[PDB]
Amino acid sequence: NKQAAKQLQDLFSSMNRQEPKNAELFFRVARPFGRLACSDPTLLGITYLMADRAAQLRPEMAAYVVEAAAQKLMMDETTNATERFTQALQLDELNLEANAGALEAQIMAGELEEAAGQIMFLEDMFTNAAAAPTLLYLKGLLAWKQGMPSEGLGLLERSIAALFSAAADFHGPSLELYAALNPARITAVVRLLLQSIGGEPRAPTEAPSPLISKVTRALDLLNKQAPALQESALLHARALYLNGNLDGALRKAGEILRMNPEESSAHLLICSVYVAQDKPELAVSALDQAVSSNFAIRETPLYHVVQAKVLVANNKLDDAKRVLESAMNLPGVRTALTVQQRARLGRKVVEPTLHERATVYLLLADVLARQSKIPDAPEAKKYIQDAIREFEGTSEEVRVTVADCELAIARGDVEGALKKLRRIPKESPHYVKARMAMADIYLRHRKDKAAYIKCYMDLVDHTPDYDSYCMLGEAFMQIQEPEKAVRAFESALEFSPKDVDLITRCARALVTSHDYQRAIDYYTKAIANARGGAQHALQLELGNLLVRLRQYPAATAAINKALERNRDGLPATENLQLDVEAWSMLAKVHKGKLEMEGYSQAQSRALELQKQLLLKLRGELPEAVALQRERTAAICFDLAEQSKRARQFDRAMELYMEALRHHDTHVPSMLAVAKLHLANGDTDACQAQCVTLLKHDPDNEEASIMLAELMFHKEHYDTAIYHFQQLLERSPNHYGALAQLILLLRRAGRLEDVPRYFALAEAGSPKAVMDPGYHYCKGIYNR
Amino acid sequence: SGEAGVDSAWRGAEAYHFWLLAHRQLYAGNVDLAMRTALHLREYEDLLDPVEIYSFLALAAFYNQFFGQCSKAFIKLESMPSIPNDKRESFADLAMSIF
């Protein structure tokens, strides 16, 4: 805001000697970035300020006024959102943007059900407008506010897909992009879909939730559109924290803390991931990072959950209990806040999702159980029953019966937990997740595979969900019948394909059951869970499957087609490195096609592409400055090896030079140039490679051992036997090194540390005297 | 108590006698009889390390090229991984190459 604040201040100073209000002037002040106010609160003080100075000047046109009330609506501040939307409704009542935004304003101004009574007229006029962004976000938002998620999920994802299609015209993070990408409505969809999980850790190998996968894919696409938005990376890694991708969330939060100077929500995410990864001291370190950013972030349910369970992980029962009590005693988590508070408070209150509140109740129950002796305190049972009662029979619940299911897990009353789980028929709460909980408890804690499969028997009996038959497959995997595991995975998949996880789990059971044809068919039936580029899979991955099924001409077709790919937003040069890699293992396919000269040409063009990468892949995680000079060295190594297969070591000489000049520090390049100089008869060149390696690393096995033998070459065997006795101290019964040191010492005129290293070969290992190399070496010792 | 019969009475001592028999026969040219007396410990895998007998049978029966036992060994070396995931995935790759 700093340059923004000074530009605002001398802007308002400059407004004096020009027109203090002007229509097009004030529209162009903010409207490409007044499409949104969703990343930070710094976006408002100019966009809505001069939106008021433009629309209260004149509200006639719909674009900036409606979208400015929309960005007033992405922090749910209806007050001003309804003000501009209703001045539009007074001026242009029925429109693509005006009435759509007005109903959007209504459906979080407490009128959740009051903006869904004009369906016929709005539908016919919307069809007329489409025949002769805000509409689709309206439809998804309206479907979400009524209570049912799935229609809201689908139409909100359609809205963000349309805004991404509007985003695809731009080569990067642009102001015009932020107008057309519209991260306002997309961020609203994302934050409205983080409520399915909340502050909880999430796993896709459990009952898999594809909606957070869609959110992750969408935010990856918007990061591709704009790696210059803090909400892009922020909510992307937030969804990653809710998609089971935890360390990726850590890396993207570190990217945030790079791209913005600080971010309290990034530290919230880092400590959330750490406690979701169960990393307690790191969790409290990142918690104190957030605290140093702000201790005022404590009173919000996301940071309430993550700080509470960090301080549980930190084992500060005072701190964890005080965070959980501020969740309880101060309203906001104990009591579900109303929708009308969104108008009053702005970006402070959202309707608290019930997974998160029941998680708070469960955590407080568990810490009072730990404060007691048995894991059932009166307060523990009270909060378990509260996590039951406040979360019965709804869509956002996790505990109708799962709370005392887990409490009885703590008590060991798994069968009482089992009948408690019998009380619920479907995964409106955590039916399936407590199913796998008590089932794995039966499997390992109780050592009962029969009850392990019986839990999923009764789960598929109650709700025949796809995850239920998936865990039928998992228990059949356990019973040492992986074919049954396969068959229950197709039972799960052909019940309903709801996630790529299920079909790819079927493919993985086909992999472990040695039936790869349907495995890779499911890999070509699990194309991608959402958009982001399917032909990359359908070409490179498909060529990999053809390599697996041994179709190398088809591999060449698919992979040579793969290496002309592209992305959206900013397509960075990983397109070109994947072209290089597709060409390189395309050359590997050519080698598998027995084309030895075909290998030479294809791997030489991969060599020259990695020579580009030797100069163009140097930064962007800049370990590539060593990686690619290793890679082009190794590909000219493989081409030198092909020249050996073409029967020319002088070409191997040239490409060993070429590997040396790719990477000087390249240790096997020193080996290769030394060995084919010794083929030419150059011990001095090998000693020069020893010197260069000694510069590259002072104590290497090559450097020390072969330095020792190179002055041993003039009968200085003490250093040679010293380095080889170091070798058989480090590697006691290394039979090649055993033979080498024993013959060297014998030819050093020494038979004294010969049986010492024979005994050291069998000192720590009481199975070494019967070893074959030890047999041979002790034999030649007796010779 | 123990397994039925006087011949199966001291089933722990019998278990380790058969296990040391397997260990001796692995390097005495009797690798198949080591496989049979480790199939003896397919019952006696509870008192010893089950991963030890599993890897013993899998990595000296696949290398004996008993193709049905090769398939079962690679089932064990891919499904339910008790073999450490490095060599488990290496023999998974071999299963994806062999079978």
TrEMBL record, chain A:
TPR-type repeats, residues: 466-499, 701-734
Domain (Tetratricopeptide repeat protein 21A/21B second ARM) ranges: 6-128, 133-277
Every Tetratricopeptide repeat protein 21A/21B fourth ARM domain range: 502-660
Gene Ontology biological-process annotations: RNA processing
Domain called Tetratricopeptide repeat protein 21A/21B fifth ARM repeats: residue spans: 701-783
Alphabetically ordered keywords of this record: Cell projection, Cilium, Flagellum, Repeat, TPR repeat
Entry GO CC: ciliary plasm; intraciliary transport particle A; motile cilium
Family note: Belongs to the TTC21 family.
Protein name as it appears in the record: Intraflagellar transport protein 139
UniProtKB/TrEMBL annotation, chain B:
Organism of derivation: Chlamydomonas reinhardtii (Chlamydomonas smithii)
Coiled coil: none
Localization of this protein: Cytoplasm, Cytoskeleton, Cilium basal body
Record protein name field: Intraflagellar transport protein 121
Domain IFT121-like TPR repeats: 7-99
